[PDB]
Design a protein around this ligand. Structure first.
Ligand SMILES: CO[C@H]1/C=C/O[C@@]2(C)Oc3c(C)c(O)c4c(c3C2=O)C2=NC3(CCN(CC(C)C)CC3)NC2=C(NC(=O)/C(C)=C/C=C/[C@H](C)[C@H](O)[C@@H](C)[C@@H](O)[C@@H](C)[C@H](OC(C)=O)[C@@H]1C)C4=O
Ligand SMILES: CO[C@H]1/C=C/O[C@@]2(C)Oc3c(C)c(O)c4c(c3C2=O)C2=NC3(CCN(CC(C)C)CC3)NC2=C(NC(=O)/C(C)=C\C=C\[C@H](C)[C@H](O)[C@@H](C)[C@@H](O)[C@@H](C)[C@H](OC(C)=O)[C@@H]1C)C4=O
Ligand SMILES: CCCCCCCCCCCCCCCCCCCC(=O)O[C@H](COC(=O)CCCCCCCCCCCCCC)COP(=O)(O)OCCN
Ligand SMILES: CCCCCCCCCCCCCCCCCCCC(=O)O[C@H](COC(=O)CCCCCCCCCCCCCC)COP(=O)(O)OCCN
Ligand SMILES: CCCCCCCCCCCCO[C@@H]1O[C@H](CO)[C@@H](O[C@H]2O[C@H](CO)[C@@H](O)[C@H](O)[C@H]2O)[C@H](O)[C@H]1O
Ligand SMILES: CCCCCCCCCC(=O)OC[C@H](CO)OC(=O)CCCCCCCCC
Ligand SMILES: CCCCCCCC
Ligand SMILES: CCCCCCCC
Ligand SMILES: CCCCCC
Ligand SMILES: CCCCCC
Lengths: 156, 1034, 144, 96, 48, 48
């Protein structure tokens, strides 16, 4: 928990591109985290800040870093419908089949909120469509329960 | 009327006696307080949802109450907060002049009908509707020195053995308990509950059954069998009254025969209702009582009565319990009265000296000494009739009026002494002629000063409420002074004053008085020669007049505006703000370090530190705290270095070193119920259901644009809290239904354990108190502890919480704000150095129009006050100027001549602005009322000069310059006498550095500086004004 | 007669009756109002583009306009010429009978699965010694 | 209903009485709690006091106490109204 | 349908409603518009 | 009854002082008031 590391977390969250650029030059800790275990990349992915995700990855940010409940930035990017960030993370070697503590993959989260374009991107980068969570429910089981005709057709 | 009371001096004495008795009666009965009701009537609806998050509170309580706040009279705006402490505060602010009782009952009544719409848990806790606009008289702190009692133990004793007796004390309006009475705390254990196959549901069911009142009936009750002898009430199960009884509550009976009790699966003790607040007084555990003054009550008597009743409780206290007084306003109000009584007595003493210095006889000096107290006494009687209280505003209203009261006495007596000297008439005949010259002017002056001061009362809101206190006080004091000057003083002059020989100006005497008379007579000849020279070349002084008017306008823009001066009240605050998501323990360590500083570094100044952890006026999360620092007496802290302002700056610079804690010390405002009332209060509104996130993005967009204008805006902060990580858990319905676990049992087990649950009441030593069931700390700290909780299914098997739930981290609001029913985010800020509030507010409106679609705004608090108060100002200034002109026009019988009087205004104002700028004070209300009294007395001096000058031209048929020179010759002595007395009178108020010095400095500096210029300039310039105006308009 | 006191006296007596009333009547919200029988004005609202139906316009008036008008000083009563939206569960008796269910089971399910739970906090007061984490627990919320 | 005088005094009467503080023009406050369960707290005000404003101020202070009362007391409903001790007349009714 | 509160002024209340409606108009959806098909206050204002 | 008895002396006091000042005002004298107001005891003993 460094001085610059705490400022990078707040900067990445707010989306101040100019401040993040300055903190990367001063050597702010990219692997710094809060109490729940969220990196600047987690926060940047959550609030949908495309530039800061790109800047952090170039400065050796952990793409497959996970919080205290095992959620990676790809989960947050896929769940909250950030198509651009999901592509950038997967290009920089993001684990597409990353399981959290509950066995919920990014495909499950993208399926639940009905983000059709993100499901196609995840499936392209090799998302396990038959991947089950702790309750034994696939991305298809989520689509039929939510009543999504378009999503159910794609997950064939 | 003057001629009537000269022949009837006893009837004049009767009117004087009636006024003195009415005044003396008023002084005994008049209410006493620090400040009157200034803030507008506010009604805060407070409710509690134990273990509820901000959104749960908003979406089940806040929105439901808000929707039912209709058909309520004189509602200006409605603002509410919903935070993760499980609390809601809905404040409805009402129009100034609205009945607060009618306002409260209408809000109360509409809430009562909405109670069935709220959740059962909220209905059980209940909802409180209180007046939040009032403030505390004193805060009585209760501590434990021997360390035998916790803050919970002290709070219970105060609730049981003190609070009620303090409430019944004479003049006590309201008593708030700083803490809570005991609660029966069942600290549940998930390991023990799972061992005997039980849940928090089983604990709640058992407590409700085995702790309750049961209705029975009567033996031989009506209708009876004829021949019944005995009739008696049947007593059944009453509520439990001890931890031992709660321990023996039977939960389950096993096959073997062993009894599973409540003490076998939980720790049972008397604790607090809520554990959010940790209050400490110099390290020791502490509680307290916030006491508010009742309506029409005496603050001095109430405080003495509170201390008297606390003394009676001394023998009954446990060992080590002591009473302390961290906050008490009564000492301040005690000094406020003593200093004002001193000023009024010193003012009368200075008049006695100056009257004897010039007139040189004891009989003359007694006439003002009688007349001034008669007017001051009468003023209290008129204030009593209007229903006003003796407060800081009304008391300084008297002090500012001294200049006008003193002049009325000197002007009347001095003119009689002059007429006797010049013409050689006896006292009675001399007074008839003397009063004949001024009686018309004195009535004219009354109407002019009325037109100046009366329109000040008709300002709107909190500003107008303060201006109303000075207006009614000064107008009443001035009005009685004119009546006393026409009724009493003429009678006193005719009866008491001795005759003076013709052409006797005390030049024949020797010693000091002989020298003074010869010196002043030649000084008068030097003055007349000087004015003669000025009137030959008037054009040069009209240029010098414009330089003063330009100099006045320049200093008006330069001098920065404020509301009231911050006072050393022997108390100040130190806020502690840790990063978001920080725990209670981390905040305590910073407060302990802050408490350590004040007791080490400022041991000579600081008396005590009231460290209130987990407390804040804009939400009460664990990360925020506050420390109420109480100082020693004013005598024990000499010099400017040992004052609150000096200690504030030293403290703030010291705590800036500390990491992971934003810590600032700051002084209280003048009117503590109102606040600073300097900057602006902005509301950003969600007008089209955008949501929390989009309103946050819009707020960040406005704050970013605000930062790009340091030249206009500065100190722009949001009043709200930022979003924080929260533990989202999703209960799988299919898995719960499959295993046979009901959703009620799941949501109760989670809610009761982690959040807490108010089950029912119990009687502790003849007092009803709450029974809470909650998990012991160690079993509800981390996400891993979720799996340790088991819920029984229908088939009897114990299912772990992990089996049918999934959890993740997300961001959400720990405090959701709403304004006028819609979601909002309150933004603070103030105008940059040089720029006015008007310009700063105008830019915020411009920046607001460029925010995303469906994002509106509104002004609240003092911004709402000033916008409605600002529009009224031009009209009141206009009415004042027009009526003053009309009154002077009627007096002189001329449209042109009035301008000669009204041109004096800048001569008094320029000096006040120079004195304020030099000493480095602000354009506050004390200064603004100070200008009117300076303008009033300077205008009064000019009126008598023009009246004398005009009457010589009309009656005695003298020329313009001859009359003007003869006029200012006659009026030189009384203008110097009043000025010499009044400048010396307000001199102590300038140099004062003690208690209430800020107000005294604001009153003194502006008046002294203004009176020096008003006296020195006007004696030369009023001649010029009259001759230039008379020449121009024939 | 002072209408302010008349309202207070009338409602003081209504509060004695309120608990004796049926639970369905209490939850509909009983209202005490002091106003003229006749209308001061009718504020009509239409859509010129014809994008919104009669039901859509009524909902907007009820959700965005009605409350602020009802709170305005001098407004004794506000009648909505329409209805605010509500979640309408239009039940089918044939389909309910097929799966062996009743309206009672539907109402029980809605109360259970459309719930706003008070779930407490991680690191809540009173906490253990050396607690670092403090966060609100969020369980079930109202369906949107 | 059902509670004795002592229980009723502790759970109701003292809870209301302690919140009846600093009301305008209050001369004295008499009250009694009985075996049947009834409470009656009479607040007598100064001569010339507006009885309607007095009623409002009492009602405002009661609703602070109301939440601290038991549920059974809230279910019966607590009345706040102007009162007098003596009867104007007694109208009797008989059957001939 | 707005009914006047007992004792309140017709013109002042009508002015207060128009002022509150004016705050809402900017934030309407496209097409939505206020119309005044019944008002008793204009007669009182014009007749005086 | 207690209140009636406690405020009776001050009621007599102010009542006497007002009548004295009213006589002093009307007749422009101190002697005439003092001459008149000495009669009060002569009446009061008759009532007792
Ligand atoms: C450095 O700028 C900040 C200082 C912080 O330090 C503290 C310790 O000094 C303060 C001083 C001296 C204050 O008078 C207030 C607060 C603070 C601080 O917190 C408040 N604190 C909060 C409660 C806590 N949160 C903080 C959270 C986001 C971390 C919000 C602010 N509310 C606060 C207030 N009342 C209100 O909300 C409202 C409705 C009242 C009136 C508003 C006017 C416009 C302001 O009063 C204005 C005259 C000025 O005081 C502020 C612009 C102040 O800037 C100064 C000193 O010029 C900033 C607040 C205050 O009156
Ligand atoms: C020592 O207590 C005073 C501090 C003064 O010193 C100052 C200079 O430091 C402050 C600090 C450090 C603050 O954090 C705040 C304020 C002030 C001060 O002013 C506020 N100032 C105001 C803003 C202006 N309005 C009036 C307006 C209509 C002109 C009220 C005051 N509220 C304020 C806040 N913001 C809010 O959240 C709002 C908008 C509501 C708050 C609700 C509270 C719970 C209630 O209103 C009421 C029960 C009481 O708590 C206050 C009135 C309290 O007074 C007393 C007697 O206790 C003052 C906070 C603050 O958070
Ligand atoms: C919102 C802000 C507040 C609003 C205020 C509005 C003010 C209304 C306008 C009134 C302005 C009055 C100010 C000028 C007064 C000058 C009086 C002097 C008159 C004068 O020259 O007469 C001489 C002196 O008179 C005397 O001095 C005594 C004799 C005259 C008595 C009659 C004067 C009028 C009464 C004053 C009050 C008027 C306003 C009442 C609402 C000669 O005396 P003489 O030979 O005339 O004496 C025999 C009587 N017959
Ligand atoms: C419940 C609370 C109560 C609190 C207490 C309040 C008390 C009420 C007020 C009491 C007022 C009493 C005042 C009496 C004054 C006595 C005057 C002595 C002289 C006297 O009586 O002899 C006359 C001489 O007066 C003269 O001719 C000289 C007159 C000039 C001098 C005037 C001085 C007045 C002093 C005022 C005192 C102020 C007191 C303040 C409270 C006789 O001659 P005559 O005049 O009768 O007949 C004229 C010839 N034909
Ligand atoms: C803070 C603002 C700065 C302070 C300003 C102070 C202004 C008030 C001071 C007035 C002093 C008057 O002083 C007076 O001036 C006039 C000049 O007009 C002199 O008059 C002299 O010059 C004039 C020129 O026209 C001749 O007609 C006259 O015969 C001659 O004596 C007087 O001899 C002197 O006594
Ligand atoms: C003899 C003519 C004097 C008339 C002056 C009347 C002005 C006061 C009007 C009023 O009622 O407002 C009082 C107001 C309340 O804040 O007090 C004030 O702010 C004092 C007035 C400021 C000085 C005015 C002269 C300078 C002009 C540029
Ligand atoms: C202890 C002083 C009481 C009187 C206050 C009024 C004095 C001007
Ligand atoms: C100076 C303000 C009044 C103006 C009207 C009188 C004109 C002679
Ligand atoms: C109101 C002033 C008018 C004067 C014209 C001679
Ligand atoms: C008690 C009345 C006495 C009056 C004497 C002047």
């Amino acid at each position: 928990g460094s001085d610059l590391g705490k400022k990078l977390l707040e900067a990445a969250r707010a989306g101040r591109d100019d401040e993040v650029r300055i903190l990367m030059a001063n050597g702010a800790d990219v692997n710094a985290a809060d109490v729940v275990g969220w990196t600047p990349l987690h926060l940047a992915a959550y609030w949908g800040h495309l530039e800061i995700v790109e800047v952090l990855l170039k400065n050796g940010a952990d793409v497959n870093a996970y919080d205290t409940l095992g959620s990676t930035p790809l989960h947050l990017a896929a769940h909250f419908g950030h198509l651009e960030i999901v592509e950038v993370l997967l290009k920089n070697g993001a684990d597409v089949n990353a399981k959290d503590d509950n066995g919920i993959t990014p495909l499950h989260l993208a399926a639940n909120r009905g983000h059709l374009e993100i499901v196609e991107v995840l499936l392209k980068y090799g998302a396990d469509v038959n991947a089950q969570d702790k309750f034994g429910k696939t991305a298809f089981d989520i689509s039929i329960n939510n009543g999504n005709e378009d999503l159910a057709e794609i997950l064939q | 009327m003057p001629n009537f009371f000269i022949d009837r001096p006893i009837f004049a004495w009767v009117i004087a006696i009636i006024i003195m008795l009415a005044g003396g009666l008023a002084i005994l009965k008049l209410p006493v307080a620090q400040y009157p009701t200034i803030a507008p009537p506010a009604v805060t609806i407070s409710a509690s949802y134990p273990g509820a998050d901000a959104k749960t509170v908003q979406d089940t309580v806040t929105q439901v109450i808000e929707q039912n706040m209709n058909g309520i009279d004189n509602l200006m705006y409605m603002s509410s907060n919903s935070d993760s402490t499980g609390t809601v505060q809905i404040t409805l602010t009402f129009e100034s002049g609205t009945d607060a009782d009618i306002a409260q009952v209408q809000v109360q009544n509409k809430l009562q009908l909405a109670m069935p719409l709220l959740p059962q848990e909220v209905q059980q806790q209940g909802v409180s509707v209180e007046k939040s606009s009032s403030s505390f008289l004193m805060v009585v702190g209760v501590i434990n020195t021997d360390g035998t009692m916790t803050q919970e133990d002290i709070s219970d004793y105060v609730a049981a053995n003190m609070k009620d007796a303090i409430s019944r004390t004479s003049g006590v309006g309201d008593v708030q308990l700083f803490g809570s009475q005991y609660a029966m705390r069942i600290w549940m254990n998930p390991n023990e509950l799972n061992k005997f196959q039980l849940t928090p549901v089983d604990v709640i069911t058992a407590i409700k059954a085995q702790n309750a009142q049961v209705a029975a009936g009567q033996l031989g009750g009506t209708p009876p069998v004829k021949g019944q002898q005995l009739n008696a009430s049947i007593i059944a199960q009453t509520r439990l009254t001890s931890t031992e009884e709660f321990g023996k509550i039977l939960l389950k009976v096993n096959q073997d025969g062993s009894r599973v009790l409540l003490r076998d699966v939980a720790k049972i003790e008397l604790g607090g209702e809520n554990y959010d607040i940790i209050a400490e007084f110099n390290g020791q555990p502490a509680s307290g009582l916030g006491i508010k003054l009742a309506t029409g009550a005496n603050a001095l008597d109430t405080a003495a009565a509170i201390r008297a009743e606390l003394a009676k409780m001394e023998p009954f206290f446990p060992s080590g319990l002591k009473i302390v007084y961290p906050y008490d306003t009564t000492p301040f109000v005690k000094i406020s009265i003593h200093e004002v009584v001193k000023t009024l007595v010193e003012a009368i003493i200075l008049v006695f000296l100056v009257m004897y210095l010039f007139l040189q006889n004891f009989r003359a000096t007694l006439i003002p000494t009688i007349a001034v107290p008669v007017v001051l006494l009468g003023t209290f009687a008129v204030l009593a009739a209007f229903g006003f209280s003796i407060n800081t505003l009304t008391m300084f209203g008297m002090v500012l009026a001294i200049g006008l009261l003193v002049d009325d006495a000197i002007v009347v007596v001095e003119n009689v002494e002059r007429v006797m000297a010049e013409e050689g008439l006896p006292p009675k005949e001399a007074t008839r002629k003397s009063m004949g010259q001024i009686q018309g002017a004195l009535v004219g002056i009354a109407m002019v000063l009325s037109a100046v001061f009366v329109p000040m009362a008709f300002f709107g809101g909190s500003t107008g409420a303060i201006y109303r206190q000075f207006s009614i006080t000064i107008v009443s004091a001035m009005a009685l002074s004119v009546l006393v000057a026409l009724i009493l003083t003429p009678a006193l002059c005719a009866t008491m004053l001795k005759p003076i020989a013709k052409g006797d100006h005390g030049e024949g005497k020797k010693g000091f008085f002989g020298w003074f008379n010869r010196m002043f007579e030649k000084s008068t000849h030097h003055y007349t020669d000087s004015v003669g020279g000025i009137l030959r070349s008037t054009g040069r002084y009209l240029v010098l007049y414009l330089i003063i008017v330009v100099g006045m306008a320049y200093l008006f823009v330069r001098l920065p505006s404020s509301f009231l001066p911050d006072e050393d009240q022997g108390v100040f605050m130190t806020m502690v703000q840790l990063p978001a998501g920080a725990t209670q323990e981390r905040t305590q360590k910073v407060l302990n370090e802050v408490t350590h500083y004040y007791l080490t570094k400022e041991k000579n100044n600081v008396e005590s530190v009231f460290a209130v952890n987990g407390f804040g006026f804009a939400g009460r999360p664990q990360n925020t705290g506050i420390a109420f620092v109480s100082l020693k007496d004013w005598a024990d802290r000499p010099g400017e270095e040992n004052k609150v302002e000096a200690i504030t700056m030293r403290a703030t610079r010291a705590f800036s070193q500390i990491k992971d804690a934003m810590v600032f010390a700051f002084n209280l405002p003048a009117i503590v119920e109102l606040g600073t009332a300097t900057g602006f209060d902005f509301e950003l509104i969600d007008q089209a259901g955008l949501g929390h996130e989009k309103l946050t993005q819009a707020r960040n967009q406005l704050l970013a644009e605000a930062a790009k204008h340091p030249d206009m805006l500065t100190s722009v902060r949001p009043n709200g809290l930022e979003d924080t990580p929260q533990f989202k858990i999703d209960i799988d319905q299919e898995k719960a239904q499959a295993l046979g676990v009901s959703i009620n049992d799941i949501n109760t087990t989670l809610g009761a354990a982690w959040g807490g649950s108010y089950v029912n009441d119990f009687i502790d030593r003849g007092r009803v108190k709450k029974v809470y069931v909650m998990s012991e700390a160690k079993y509800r700290m981390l996400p891993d502890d979720i799996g340790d909780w088991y819920v029984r299914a229908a088939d009897g098997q114990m299912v772990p919480f992990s089996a049918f739930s999934s959890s993740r981290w997300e961001y959400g609001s720990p405090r959701l704000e709403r304004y006028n029913g819609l979601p909002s985010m309150e933004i603070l800020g103030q105008a940059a150095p040089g720029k006015s509030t008007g310009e700063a507010m105008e830019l915020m409106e411009q920046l607001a129009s460029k925010l995303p679609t469906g994002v509106g705004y509104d002004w609240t608090g003092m911004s709402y006050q000033e916008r409605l108060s600002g529009n009224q100002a031009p009209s009141l200034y206009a009415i004042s100027l027009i009526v003053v002109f009309l009154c002077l026009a009627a007096l002189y019988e001329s449209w042109s001549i009035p301008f000669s009087v009204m041109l004096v205004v800048p001569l008094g104002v320029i000096g006040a602005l120079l004195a304020a700028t030099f000493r480095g004070l602000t354009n506050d209300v004390y200064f603004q009322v100070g200008l009117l009294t300076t303008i009033g007395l300077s205008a009064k001096n000019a009126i008598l000069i023009v009246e004398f000058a005009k009457d010589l031209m009309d009656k005695e048929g003298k020329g313009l310059i001859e009359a003007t020179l003869d006029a200012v010759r006659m009026r030189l002595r009384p203008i110097l006498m009043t000025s010499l007395a009044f400048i010396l009178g307000v001199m102590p108020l300038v140099i004062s550095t003690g208690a209430g010095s800020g107000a005294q400095n604001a009153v003194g500096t502006g008046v002294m500086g203004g009176m020096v210029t008003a006296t020195v300039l006007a004696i030369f310039f009023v001649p010029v004004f009259f001759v230039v105006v008379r020449r121009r308009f024939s």
